C-alpha cells in the first residue's frame, strides 16, 4: 500500500481498514513485486529462485 497508494496510514486523510474489506488483502497482494519482498526481509537470491508467484 505504501508503494501503490497514499503512504499515509495514520491521520485524518488516511484509510483505516475497518470496513470488513476482505478483498483488500487479495487485490493488494496481486500487485506484489520482488522489491516488496525485499522490504519484507526475503533475501534477493531466494526471490530469484522462485519465479512463479500465485496470490490467494
Amino acid at each position: 500500500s505504501h508503494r501503490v497508494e497514499t503512504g499515509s496510514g495514520i491521520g485524518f486523510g488516511a484509510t483505516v481498514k475497518a470496513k470488513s474489506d476482505k478483498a483488500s488483502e487479495g487485490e493488494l497482494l496481486a500487485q506484489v513485486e520482488p522489491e516488496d519482498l525485499i522490504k519484507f526481509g526475503l533475501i534477493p537470491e531466494f526471490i530469484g529462485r522462485l519465479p512463479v508467484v500465485a496470490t490467494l
Binding site: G9, I10, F12, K17, A18
Partner: protein, 192 residues
C-alpha cells in the same frame, strides 16, 4: 523521574516507560492544564491508536484544572471523528474543559470515581483595545458559550435552558450528582 517497565514478548523483553506502556493498552492521560502542545500530543495518540485496531475502545483518564477552549475542542473533534469509542474516566478533578471532554465520551462508557469532583462554568476571556475590537471579541466568545452549551446539552440530555442557568456561575458536582445531571453513566467503586 518516570519509572521503566519490562514487557515480555515472543522476540524477548522490551523496555517501556510507565506512560508508554499504558499507551500500548489504549490508555491516554490528560493531566494538567489544557494547552496547544499538550492537546496535539493527545491527538497524535488517538490517531495512532486508531490505526492498529479501529474497533477497540480508547480510554482517556481526565484529571485537570481546565484550560483553553480552542485546544480542548481539538481533542473533542478528534474523539468524535475516530471510529473507536472513547471511554472517559474522571479521577480527581474535572474543570470546564475536563468536564466537557468527560461528557463527550461514548454513551455508556463515561465513568467517574466516587470521590471525584466535577466543575462546570462559562468561558473566560477578555480583550484590551478599541471599542470596535471589543465588540468583535465580545460576540466571538458569546458564540463559543452557546456552541459549548449546545454540545453539553446533547451529551448530558438536559435542556439548553437548564444548562445555561446552571453554568452562569461555578457549579460543583460529585460523582452521584454527575450521574443525575448526565455527565457520566456509571461510577467505578471496586473491581468487578
Amino acid at each position: 523521574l518516570v519509572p521503566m517497565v519490562i514487557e515480555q514478548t515472543s522476540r524477548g523483553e522490551r523496555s517501556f516507560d510507565i506512560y508508554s506502556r499504558l499507551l500500548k493498552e489504549r490508555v491516554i492521560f490528560l493531566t494538567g492544564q489544557v494547552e496547544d502542545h499538550m492537546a496535539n500530543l493527545i491527538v497524535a495518540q488517538m490517531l495512532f491508536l486508531e490505526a492498529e485496531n479501529p474497533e477497540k475502545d480508547i480510554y482517556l483518564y481526565i484529571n485537570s484544572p481546565g484550560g483553553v477552549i480552542t485546544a480542548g475542542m481539538s481533542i473533542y473533534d478528534t474523539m468524535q471523528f475516530i471510529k473507536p469509542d472513547v471511554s472517559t474516566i474522571c479521577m480527581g478533578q474535572a474543570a470546564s474543559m475536563g468536564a466537557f471532554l468527560l461528557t463527550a465520551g461514548a454513551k455508556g462508557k463515561r465513568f467517574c470515581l466516587p470521590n471525584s469532583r466535577v466543575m462546570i462554568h462559562q468561558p473566560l476571556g477578555g480583550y484590551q483595545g478599541q471599542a470596535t475590537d471589543i465588540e468583535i471579541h465580545a460576540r466571538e466568545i458569546l458564540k463559543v458559550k452557546g456552541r459549548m452549551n449546545e454540545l453539553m446539552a446533547l451529551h448530558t440530555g438536559q435542556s439548553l435552558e437548564q444548562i445555561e442557568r446552571d453554568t452562569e456561575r461555578d457549579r460543583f458536582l460529585s460523582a452521584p450528582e454527575a450521574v443525575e445531571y448526565g455527565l457520566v453513566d456509571s461510577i467505578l467503586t471496586h473491581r468487578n
